[PDB]
Design a protein around this ligand. Structure first.
Ligand SMILES: [Hg+2]
Ligand SMILES: [Hg+2]
Ligand SMILES: [Hg+2]
Lengths: 170, 170, 170
């Protein structure tokens, strides 16, 4: 009846997820590259000058930790929620392709996607501050900050639909 | 036998969730009314002296991001869980009003309420420091902070009960 | 069939959860020992001097709030996730020792362990900065922080294994 209507919505949200996943990978790789190449800390004048300013803008956002001379560590926690969200998608998508296993494995996937949703919400609230900060948009390109943003907003929304449809099936 | 007990514990927990929404929104609006009236940044004089404390006080908590001259974004993440709790309350309540759909719908609510709960727990640790910080209590008065805090404690336990009752049911 | 394999994974994960629980509490007791006794603030020289950088290092992490002169509250949010992990242990061990109670009580334990898993993650990404930050390792010795970070990894994994087997059981 509508249980056939539901499997469709679950099929959509997995495309929505996988679509979202690529957009976050885009924005994250953009910022990581931009962080990997930074003119600021090269000369020691721009170290004593820009190390406090770098630390205080990334700390001001209360999620991302500041790693001024460690660009690989800067986004380490943002790279994590992407890895985690893919691990969930590996499950939630395999729930869709072989729906027979939803009986057994659905409580597992929800327990993980419940946790994943919190890290995205924490990120969005934190990265929204990055877009409202001019110095942030200056050093890290404002479109790279925005690409990662909408990527996560898609993830959270795709998780919401993944929660509804996979939550109620059969 | 055990079920009619759990349904009452579920209906009771659903009502205590409702009373928790008031006290939260009360102190949340009380703090917001305080954030909109701040005369610190009225005088350009006070703009320079009070801003370093205003940022430090809020950023000393690892949750609430400091928006000194943007009072609308100050509590933005507090209002989020309020709306998110409201959305999750819509899910959990319709479960208890039409218990037949607890079968199909239940894991949707448990997934969100999980994500919703940690957002509640992360908030209380923050507000606690604000209750333990004198500068914050002078600007935003204590009863406003404590009211928002008292409410946050109430939706926390109410969500905890809903997980125990709605969680284990027929 | 494969069901008894899942149960073997559950028993080992439940014992890995208990085994992990000790290592974190040790690393937490080490830090609280070092926090409850430190002479930085013994004299008014160290109070005015080291308090700004004390509040700088903890707030440099995006998680742990800085309480320089009140060591009782210093690690407060870290002791919290330790009790929440134990409360879930009562739930998931009751499920694992008495599998009868699983069907009704598993969503209760799953919803709670879903929220517990994100607090362990948020802690890890934070205390990692402590390990990567030189000034923080001189006050609280590096072995104490690693002892704490050890148990936090072991706790998060055993939660992931528990969620897998306890979620997929029967
Ligand atoms: Hg699955
Ligand atoms: Hg519902
Ligand atoms: Hg249980």
């Amino acid at each position: 009846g509508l249980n056939k209507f539901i499997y469709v919505g679950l099929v959509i949200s997995q495309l929505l997820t996988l679509a979202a996943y690529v957009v976050v990978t885009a924005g994250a790789a953009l910022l990581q590259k931009k962080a990997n190449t930074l003119t600021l800390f090269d000369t020691q004048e721009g170290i004593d000058k820009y190390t406090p300013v770098y630390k205080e803008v990334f700390t001001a956002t209360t999620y991302i930790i500041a790693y001024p001379q460690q660009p690989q560590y800067q986004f380490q926690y943002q790279w994590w929620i992407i890895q985690f969200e893919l691990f969930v998608f590996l499950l939630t998508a395999a729930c869709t392709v072989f729906p027979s296993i939803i009986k057994r494995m659905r409580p597992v996937a929800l327990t993980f996607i419940a946790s994943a949703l919190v890290l995205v919400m924490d990120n969005i609230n934190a990265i929204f501050f990055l877009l409202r900060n001019e110095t942030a948009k200056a050093v890290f390109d404002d479109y790279r900050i925005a690409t990662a943003q909408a990527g996560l907003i898609m993830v959270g929304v795709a998780n919401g639909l993944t929660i509804f449809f996979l939550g109620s099936y059969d």
